[PDB]
RNA sequence: UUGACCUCAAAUCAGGUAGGAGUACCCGCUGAACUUAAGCAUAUCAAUAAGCGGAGGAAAAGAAACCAACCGGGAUUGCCUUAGUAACGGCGAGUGAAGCGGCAAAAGCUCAAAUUUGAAAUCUGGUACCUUCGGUGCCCGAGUUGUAAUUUGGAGAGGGCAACUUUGGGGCCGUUCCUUGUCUAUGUUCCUUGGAACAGGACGUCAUAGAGGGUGAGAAUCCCGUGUGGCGAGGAGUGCGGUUCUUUGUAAAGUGCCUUCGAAGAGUCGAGUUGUUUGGGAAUGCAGCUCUAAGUGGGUGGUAAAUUCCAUCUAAAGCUAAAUAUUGGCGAGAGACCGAUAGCGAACAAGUACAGUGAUGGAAAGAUGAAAAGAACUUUGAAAAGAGAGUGAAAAAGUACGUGAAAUUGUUGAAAGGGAAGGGCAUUUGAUCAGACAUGGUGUUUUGUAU
RNA sequence: CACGGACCAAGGAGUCUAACGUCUAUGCGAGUGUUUGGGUGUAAAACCCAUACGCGUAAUGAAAGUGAACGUAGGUUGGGGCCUCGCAAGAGGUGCACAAUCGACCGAUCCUGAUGUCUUCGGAUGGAUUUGAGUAAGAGCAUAGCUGUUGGGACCCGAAAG
RNA sequence: GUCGAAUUUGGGUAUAGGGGCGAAAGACUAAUCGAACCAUCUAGUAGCUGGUUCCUGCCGAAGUUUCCCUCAGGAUAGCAG
RNA sequence: CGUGGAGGUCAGUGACGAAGCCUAGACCGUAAGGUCGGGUCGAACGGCCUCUAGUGCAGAUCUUGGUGGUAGUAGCAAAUAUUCAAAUGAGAACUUUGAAGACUGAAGUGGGGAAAGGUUCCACGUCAACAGCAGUUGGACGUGGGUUAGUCGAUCCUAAGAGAUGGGGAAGCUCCGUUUCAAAGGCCUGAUUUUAUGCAGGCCACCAUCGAAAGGGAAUCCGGUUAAGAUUCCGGAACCUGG
RNA sequence: CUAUCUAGCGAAACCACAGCCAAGGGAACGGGCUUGGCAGAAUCAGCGGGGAAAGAAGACCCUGUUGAGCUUGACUCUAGU
RNA sequence: GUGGCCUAUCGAUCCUUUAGUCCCUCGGAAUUUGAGGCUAGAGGUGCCAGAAAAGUUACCACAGGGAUAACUGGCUUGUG
């Protein structure tokens, strides 16, 4: 069972698993089905884009906080900024977030701006008559872009002021490692007499 | 594929190729890592040693994000420029134009000093960074300013 | 299916 | 099927029976009965090692691999001694690579368009297709493949305004452009060289496709592939003049016995 | 080729098809070619053969031999003609099944729906 | 005495509804062991099989009492990845998620808790009529122990001020979708073989049709079809594209500022204990008992507890397409699949025949020939059948039928043979058999005058 | 004087998969991998593609955390090949890979504990018969194949049992 | 042997698998009983036996070490390619 | 080396005969195997470069099928027993008739039934298989006919027992229990004379149902009749129930 | 009455190939091998020396890290109480 | 002089516990308990490279063994 030099494996096909093996064979056809449903959901909402438009929003999580990325809606605050209501913008093309709050005002500014490009880009038809026609897309994500914010420039100049600048983060570290026990040490300070 | 194989080979010769004393079995010492404190334990102990025991502390829910620190050693650090403005920013060894490197837009998350970046000026945003590697930067004639 | 009695010894046999 | 084989009770006698210890069917009447089960030795057996649809079917190859070999399938289009090699018949070609106009593209009609061919002269590549209808050997034939037949030419161009309709019943014929260009069309068995027949706009664009040495190939990231020898007559390499220079004379090719 | 998604090139449907079709389709199945003459003064190429329509043959060890229809056997997939005959040993004369498609149609038996069919092919009568 | 209310009943009362089948996939309940650990008891197999209940074309889940600790994200589902990781585990064998990120698909919402109180404004049923998937009127009834309007936490409501902005419903005809019908090119021209030409050769034609099948043998061109387009028929339908009639509405909704307010789900959350379960570790979830809350509260924040802060949602009520699944059913298309001991158990009157008290078990069995033309007739025989004749391209195709192997047997022929036969090296004997014996050559003694 | 075999036909036993090891071939190369998906198409093919993701490019400690040049990226010995002298033999110089060996660097452990300071923080410097699956002008990624390994019915047949 | 009864027997009826019934033999429970039969889990596991399909060419063993509830087996080193 | 299939080529072979099979006929190769000739046969098949795998049998008390020696052998010997003639027929140890001799010996080899079987009953025709020899015969084969009830039985009653309802358990398939902690139903006379059936009275309380072709039980016997039916049909003579 | 012979009918077990011995050696008791003796078609009835005759993967014994039935202050549990 | 004049006198993982550093962690941020870790020992496995473990079967079963008994035979011949 153990022999020679070899890894310890770890396959996990001590149970009946081969009565669960989904092979995708069905991977081809599917695609064809989907680029037909998409074509029949474009055919059925002939002048709209098949896409709402989605908002620019930060990403969580440190490891992807440097990156910028498409969220779900645009936090009614925003559209209110943008002028128009979000039970309007909902039959615009436009998605509205209620439970997403802005704790930003680059993203603020960036997702207003967004809107207002969207609403002078757009024409919205009558209820009543002509329908003039207007050659329909079939992304407002393609039109509109994601651009990831450009946060600095290319050359500058140098300000070294002289701190070195791993002392800093190890005072940092150094800091926060021993705040409570200095709080501790001045609240028995003052507790003297 | 099957006629490249050696059982092809096989065909003819009785035991294929499993001998007649030892007639290939189903399991004659076990099934998988059994035996591993026993009868397989020279094994374990010659090639797998470790295999046994507990060596420390726990971490319950542990997110393999808080740990993000993929390192740059100072050697490449103009890999992220492109080159088409490289020997520009080489050659013009300049103070007042000296060229930003953003690591952390690039995917890194600390610097460190392995070896001989050039006698040029650069400006290094990073989260973190290490202490030759500073020392190292500003003896080139630049700095290190810290972001997040 | 058959299970005929007559092979059936102990006579000599242990 | 997984079932198969698996369809019945069976369990072996044992020992005292005078029989082999396979599982064998019970109950009585039919014949069936008795009989050996579940044993690939054993009719109405299982198969041993029962084919799954969890077999590798379909294989990776790496894109620049891809490249290079449809790149080296193009390269030996426009060479005789490899085309003749897989018989397409172009020893009456005046040259290849054989390139025509762009009012191929637009033909709509099978009959001028193989009088086009006929006219360049892929005649007998066609006809040899035309002659070369043979049934299969093959259990095939009853498996919806009861025909063989050799290909002719494939047709290349740059936009279709008719030509792929009017060779597509042409047997033989294929037809391609020159983004896609399919390996299993341009090396069809392996066997490298077969007859194509370019337009100039397709001939054209073939830089633009695969790029040169001045331009670049619209495939991001993609340069040909270089040489690791500068020429393949290597026989003029060894008797140009500066090797020849530094040999030693030679021998007589076939020793002589000695003793 | 064939282009179409609800077409098979398959030659275990088609044969089944071809076994298994009822008397309506296998009307269509056994249809004839006309004759020249007929070609020219209706315009027509073939047609669903008939009980008594006049024929030729122009396949077969009866090559040359006319005859009226004399019954369509769609079952047996043929077609029996009165003066084509084989004489037995026993002084009886069995029909001959003959396919329609190795027969010409000299002469037509006709009625309204004939000649509807004839018009809707792009038919002159 | 009479008439009501509450509760409980009966009626072959008036109208309806549930059951059972199928069950591949789906929601749940119940619930193993074989097995692995080289023994075995935890563990694993497995939160599986069997068993029970309940659905649909999908189901379920789903619009956060979520994830996070970021410059924060934002219903659910599914794929790549996370990750064979963190973690669990006789820390052994082994098991083992989730957040992030990329993508597919995207859709959001409604009740309870409020006095309409200057008017139960609400609703089923019956009945008459009508333009009938329903509407109008009238009449019983339900219902204040609360039916409609208003609101659902993203908010919102009651007053006060101010301005503006936007609306509904039927027809008709197309389009869409489904089902379906019909029509739309070109040789059956010569010669040979053959029983048959669909083969071979020659000459041609059509080709947006050389896919496939049939026809007396490999058929684009004989036939059905294929390819390309056209002409219809019946339906579904509000999906939108035009036209037309009704004007819905002294109605409805949206928006700004000020003010007073802002109800928000209890034998529930939560805790202890037990059991099970989980990757979940001082206890992940579920259930049982016991205890049992609050309202600047409660829950979560993956190490129990006290204290102090912070962040983030808003449970105990509810609906909702799509992406997802699918050995079943209906309908289609394909295959480097099997090719009648194979492939489904089943190519056939197969879940048949047959067995078994029963549950259950469970086969074998394909091919004459193009066409029965399936052998008229004569004769021997009691007859079966034979010999002849005859059909057929062939009876070396005669329903014991395509080909027709071997074991095994018969006849004929040859050969040998004193308790085996068989085999090897070598030769005799007998039988049988292949190969080289032309070649260039002086040459014309030559006829056919150059052979 | 051990087992199977009366005879013949047909059938009949190291397979496929997930993850891996060594070796080998191919492509690219400090990068590599198009095929979750999108576009496209003569339609399960072929062709094209973004953002991520995986592996690798940095290890080490249980962890907090820290994080690879004194030097021509070291010295010494040997080393193919190359250069110079030589008619040659041989002599010298340079010496990749590779082997051995003494060192330097990174991390852990144990010490030493400077300027300074929220006077309890910080940890410079110099060390050590300690230690690492490390550095020291990167080699890997993907695919394919033989062989081997583990899990799976797992070369075929085979229990008593539960 | 027994033969007017603790008799013999039909039919109906009850008792169903770790259960029944048993004047007790582990006897009977449909030719099945020291735990029936059917199907499924199940191709259950097997360190044990048997078998394992073509030619040629080159090379060519071990039955020994240490450990193992190890002694009919494995890991390990050795021999071989 | 060989096999099944796949891409390619040989514009490969082929109804003037593909593949297959037979061939003490030939040739090649160390061999695996290849090739040719002949005969049979009738429709497809191969060489080379590559791909692919359900790829090569002497064995597994292997599987399925088929066939042998054994071997014209063992053997077709329990139940006392057959014989002669004629007829039929192609043919007679076995069929039919007759004559004779025997047995069962009324606790029968008789005559009837229950269960079970299912048309075996009976006729006509008939002998390929079956009847372990035969066969002109048959429970065989083929074609047909045939079972008549107020009284015989079932049907009805209860037995041991089974089992809904109400209710109660159980996650549940279903279990308990059968008069139970139930509001558990229907019978006579009428009274009216819109009239059909309400009200008038009164009575009554058991509380499903199933369970016996041998228990209990309303009533039929003779004679005759068919190839085959009879307490059933005909004839005659009776009886019971209900109205 | 069989056996026996005949007419008709017509199996099975078993079978590597087969069937003369002595000794020798040899898996230590050979039908075959070596050495010797010997050895003449085809066969019938009987027989029971041999074929280590056939019948069954020894049921005694041992081994298995295979079981089951039964017992008990074994180990671990459990309905009930 | 790093225990006994020398050659023998002893023991893994997991679990518990103790000593040491008074160091790391409890992952929204702190303090104090508690818990977890790092380094070095003890608690013990004598089948001593370390399962947690009573019998019977004259009712028996399976896989196998001539690796292994009970007969003959054969080597031997103590004993007879």
Known sequence: AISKNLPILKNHFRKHWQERVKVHFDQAGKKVSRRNARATRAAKIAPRPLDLLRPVVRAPTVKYNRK?????????????????????????????????????????????????????????????????????????????????????????????????????LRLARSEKKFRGIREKRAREKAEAE | PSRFTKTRKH???????????????????????????????????????????????????????????????????????????????????????????????????????????????????????????????????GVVELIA | FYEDYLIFDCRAKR | SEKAGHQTSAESWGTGRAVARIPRVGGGGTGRSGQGAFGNMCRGGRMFAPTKTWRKWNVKVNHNEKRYATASAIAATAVASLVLARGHRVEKIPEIPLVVSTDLESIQKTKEAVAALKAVGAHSDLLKVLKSKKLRAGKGKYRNRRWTQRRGPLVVYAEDNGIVKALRNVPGVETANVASLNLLQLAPGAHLGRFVIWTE?????????????????????????????????????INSSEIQSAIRPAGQATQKRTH | AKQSLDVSSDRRKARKAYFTAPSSQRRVLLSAPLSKELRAQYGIKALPIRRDDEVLVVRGSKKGQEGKISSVYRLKFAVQVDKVTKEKVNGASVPINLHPSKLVITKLHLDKDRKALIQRKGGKL
Not at chain 1, 142 to 148: K, L, N, R, Y
Not at chain 2, 91 to 114: F, H, Q, R, W
Request: net charge positive; aromatic share 8%.
């Open chain 4, 201 to 237: 706009a397709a001939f054209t664009k073939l830089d633009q496709v695969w790029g040169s040495e001045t331009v670049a190939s619209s495939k991001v990231g993609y340069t040909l592939p270089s040489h690791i020898i500068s020429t393949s007559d290597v026989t003029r390499i």
């Open chain 1, 68 to 168: 910028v990325r498409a969220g779900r809606g645009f936090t009614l605050a925003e559209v209110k900024a943008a002028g128009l209501t979000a039970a309007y913008a909902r039959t615009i093309g436009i998605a509205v977030d209620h439970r997403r709050q802005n704790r930003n005002q680059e993203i603020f500014d960036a997702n207003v701006q967004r809107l207002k490009e969207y609403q002078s880009k757009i024409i919205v038809f009558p209820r009543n008559g002509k329908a003039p026609e207007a050659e329909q897309v079939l992304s407002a994500a393609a039109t509109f872009p994601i651009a990831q914010p450009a946060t600095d420039v290319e050359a500058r100049a140098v300000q070294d002021n002289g701190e070195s600048a791993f002392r800093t």
């Open chain 2, 11 to 141: 065909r003819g010769h009785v035991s294929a190729g499993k001998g007649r004393i030892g007639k290939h079995r189903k399991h004659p010492g076990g099934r998988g890592m059994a035996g591993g404190q026993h009868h397989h334990r020279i094994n374990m102990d010659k090639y797998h040693p470790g295999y046994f025991g507990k060596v420390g502390m726990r971490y319950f829910h542990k997110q393999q994000a808080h740990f993000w620190k993929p390192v740059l050693n100072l050697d490449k650090l103009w890999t992220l420029i492109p080159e088409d403005k490289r020997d520009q920013y080489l050659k013009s060894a300049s103070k007042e134009t000296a060229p930003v490197i953003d690591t952390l837009a690039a995917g890194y998350g600390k610097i460190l000093g392995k070896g001989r970046i050039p006698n040029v000026p650069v400006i290094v945003k990073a989260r973190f960074v290490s202490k030759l590697a500073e020392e190292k930067i500003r003896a080139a004639g």
